[PDB]
Structures are given as structure tokens and as C-alpha cells.
Amino acid sequence: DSLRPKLSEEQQRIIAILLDAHHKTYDPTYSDFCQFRPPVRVNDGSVTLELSQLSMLPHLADLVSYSIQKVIGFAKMIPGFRDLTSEDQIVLLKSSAIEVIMLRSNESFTMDDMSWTCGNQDYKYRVSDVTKAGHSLELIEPLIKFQVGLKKLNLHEEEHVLLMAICIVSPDRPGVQDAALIEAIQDRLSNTLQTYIRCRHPPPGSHLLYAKMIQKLADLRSLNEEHSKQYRCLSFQPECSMKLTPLVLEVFG
Template sequence: MESMAASTSLPDPAGEFDRNVPRICGVCGDRATGFHFNAMTCEGCKGFFRRSMKRKAMFTCPFNGDCKITKDNRRHCQACRLKRCVDIGMMKEFILTDEEVQRKREMILKRKEEEALKESLKPKLSEEQQKVIDILLEAHRKTYDPTYSDFSKFRPPVRSKHGSKTATHSSSVVSQDFSLEDSNDVFSCDAFGAFPEPMEPQMFSNLDLSEENDESPSMNIELSHLPMLPHLADLVSYSIQKVIGFAKMIPGFRDLTAEDQIALLKSSAIEVIMLRSNQSFTMEDMSWTCGSNDFKYKVSDVTQAGHSMDLLEPLVKFQVGLKKLNLHEEEHVLLMAICILSPDRPGVQDTSLVESIQDRLSDTLQTYIRCRHPGPSSRLLYAKMIQKLADLRSLNEEYSKQYRCLSLQPEHSMQLTPLVLEVFGNEIS
């Protein structure tokens, strides 16, 4: 302890010391431990200089006064050793008094106590919270394939600069396997496991058409030529099924009634799809790449599916903003789960139970950000993520209007899959 407290260690006067270069004591050539009293020395010479200065020792060389001090003989001649200490720049002014040593010890102890307290107060993910994150990560990876390798039952994309009724018609009859029965099964007992049989459509198909006629004329889309509609309708159906699979694995979701599960999924499916699609979104050319260039979608492709530029501009802006948050995968899956478990969704009955599940997810997200996402950018990250959910609500509403507008056009309603019609509020006859 005396040796530690007896000196002040100074930084390398010449700059940062190269850690790869061996440190040599300037007095005896032994391995140095740092700068002590203004010179690079070993612990032995540091202690020798301090003791000599405090005792005001007067040494005499028994030889010629020019002894060569080494690691092995440094104890043989104290006079030449002390002279060597002074010659390399060691200064008695750097030696602490007993009072200063005591204050230094107290400061070191206080600093250690403060660091220990700070560490104890630092938020940590509980075992339960970590388990929730692990479950959500597994659920996401099981239900989201960035290569879209299992996206097989689809009508192929037909891209046309001017649109073509012939192209639309030909693409609509490809892959008849994607039938009404297959799509409708997603909301059946097979999809939800414990749901009662039979599943009545009116439980989740309540379409209000009171304002449809007023909204239709305002849609800035050319409804007569939509060659990409069949393909993107199939892609949306595929994505909805994946969202349902993800939701079923969210801790607490299966504790809800069948009616509330359906209400939550109908309202949030398109929003979760938008969140997931951010992983395939590229800011370089503002496009979505799903597995290969065959499934590379630009804004122009989406307009050929009936979506107006007035809607696509805020969608692209949303994708860019979300991408810039640089979310961890853990934060991404928690955000999707929070999006689904929203108690204010239309048709939800047990709002208190949904809210309690969402609160647990929100607490986990906030704790994760504090623990695992350090840096200035994390200070407002949670608030920015919640704002993204608010932005999604607006996008969801506008997209639903456009899909309902398409469903009112006989030539296009037949291109939409039953599952798309279900999610966007249309009844299946």
C-alpha cells in the first residue's frame, strides 16, 4: 500500500506510450511500471527514491562515485542509485505528504464506492424480460424469411409502363392454388389453434360502406390498368399469414379471446408488414428487395397496383425515417409486438388485458434501450419509435381506403385475395 500511495503516476510527456514497446526503468534497467515522480521507473526505484527523500538521507559511494546501476546490483551503492534517480529527472516535489497520501486513498475509495453504486443503479434486463426478447426473436426468425424462399403460391409480377388489360387478365389466372379456401383458412381454427369452431365470418367482417362513394372519386389512381395488383395482393396475403404466425408466439397473445385476437390482427397486420418491410428497404434507390431482383419493388411498381403517389410519398418517408433509427433486431421485434398489442384497436373487448401485455412489452423495450443501446442517439429513441407507431396508424387508414376503393371496382375486386378483403374490412360472400 505504501508503494502505491507514495507516488503520483504521470502520463508520458512525449505523448501516448506505445503499449507494445517494453518499459525500462531509467535507473536500473528493470521492467518499469510507469512514470513515478516525473520519470519512468520500476517499483523498486520508485520506493527507494521516496524513502530517501523523506528521510533526507545522505549517502556516500564506497567506490569512485560512478557505479553502473543494474537490476542485480542496485542495492550495493545507494549514493549512485540516488544520483541516477535525479539524473533521469525524478523530483522530490512530486512526492506526496502523509496527509496528501491519506486524501488520495480516501478519494480512490470514494470513487470506487460511487462506481459500485452507479453500477448497482444501472437498469438491467430481468430474466423474464430477456426471455420475452428471446421468444420474440425466435418468432420473428421463424415467420420472416428475407429471401422469401417460400413465397411460391403467387401470381407473377407484370410490369407495364402503360398498363394492359390483357396482362392483368393473364396474371390473374396463374396459380389457382391460391384459392379462397386457402386464404380464408388463415383466420380459421387451424391458424389460431384454440379458436372455437365453426368460425363465423361476421365475427371479424363488418364493413362500413357509408363513405365509400365519397372517397372513391378522390383517389388519384387509374383503376383501369393495374398489372401489378394481382401479384402484390398475393404478396400482402403471404405477409399477413406470416404476421399471424408471429403474433401467435407473442407472450400473452393466446391469453386473449378469439375475438380480441382477430380484432388486433385485422387492425395491425398492414402496420406490422410495413415495419417488417423496412428490413428489405434500400435507401440508395428507395426500393424493397425481397430475396432477389425478381422481387425488387420500386415505387412505380406499387403505383401499378393501385396506390397513389400521395400515399406512397409518406410511406417512403416513413421507411427512410425508420431505417435511420438503426434499430437492433431486439428493438425491432419488440416494436412489432407493441404494435399488435394495442388496446385502442377497434373491436377489442378486454382492453385492460391487452394494455397490461403491451405495458410489459413497452417496459422491456425501454429497459433494453437503456442497457444495450448506449450513446446519445438512444436518449430519445423510445419516443421516436412510439412516434413511428402513430405514423403507421395514418398510413394504415389511407391504405385501407385505397384497398376498399379497389374492392368496389368489379374488375379489380376479383384480383384481391379473400384474406386481403378480410383484413381491410370487406365481407367474404
């Protein structure tokens, strides 16, 4: 069959809304970064020192916090999201925030040097900057892998924003009350994505890109799980909370 239906009027609207939501919640110039607590890079080419200093934690905690604020904004503009009870909106936001952050951060990730460049160089983040924030290689290295695997999908922005949307509106998050509603909205988003890929993505000699995109959603669950383990450890460090933000405290704590 290899049927390739045209995007409906509704699907076109969903895409345009999502593109626009993303353009309003993602600054590709990174002009707000001067407002974050400054990056501090103490020398160490050591878990003990990293935990003792947490020199990068205030800057990256502010980075992530600001990003959670943006994701919330993004989430609210997803068609259907506001049809959910505010209870379910919060469950979905809290459990997906780290995953969407990892997704959206791919826009700053570059394979030039395997860094997130929001730059200049003060605002370039590498493996070692993230260890200076108290995380370890068990999270960071798979995160870099995931970023690369994700660049090599060469997603259209349409596919990129749809993926984050699909990520947020997942029916099987623990503590969701109306799984059916959530699943209906997700299916509309997946159906749009599936339709978009078949229409607009060259060639196809086959439709594997959708499966590859859903695989990334599963990778993200692991990354989420691992971050959660490591955040818990972070929070065992005395005076750690002041280096975070209320939003970061509430979302992961």
C-alpha cells in the same frame, strides 16, 4: 438519475421468444416469392390505365396476403397474446396487419435506391410498382418517408421485433373488449423495450430512441387510415376481388 436496470429473466425470455418468432416467420431469402402470381409491369411513366390493368395487384396482393399469414404466426408467439380471447386476437390482428406489414417490410427496404428489394429484380418494388397496383402517391410517398425515417433509427433486431409486438397488442384499437388485459401485455412489452434500450443501446448521451419508436406507431395509424381509404377505392374496380385473396378481402373489406 439515468438509472439503467438489468433486463429481468422474464424480459430476456420475452426478447428470445420474439427473436425466434421473427426468424420463423420472416424468410430473409424471399424463397417463396416464385409461388406468388407473377409481377406484371405494363408501361406507364396514369390513374385510368393503372385501374384498367391493375397489372401489379395480383403479385402484391399475394405478397401482402402471405405476409398477413406470417404476421398471424408472429402474433401468436407473442408472450401473453394467447391469454386473450380469440375475439380480441382477431380485432388486434385485423387492425394492425397493414401496420406490421409496413414495419416488417423495412427489412427489405434499402436506401440504395429507395426500393424494397426481395431480389433479383423481378422482386424489387418501387413507387411505380405500387401505383401499378392501384394506389396513389398520397399513400406511397409518406410510406417511403416512413421507411427511411425507420432505417435511420438503426434498430437492433430486438427493438424491431419488440416494436411489431407493441404495434399488435394496442389497447385502443376500435372494437377491443378487454382493453385492460391488452394494455397489461403491451406495458410488459414497452417496459422490456425501454429497459433494453437503456442497457444495450450505445451511448446514451440521452434516451430519445424510445420516443422516436412510439412516434412511428402514431405515423402508422395515419398510414393505416390512408391505405384503408385507398383500398376502398381499389375495391370499387370491377373484377378486383379475383386479383386479391380471401384473406386480403376479409382483413380490409
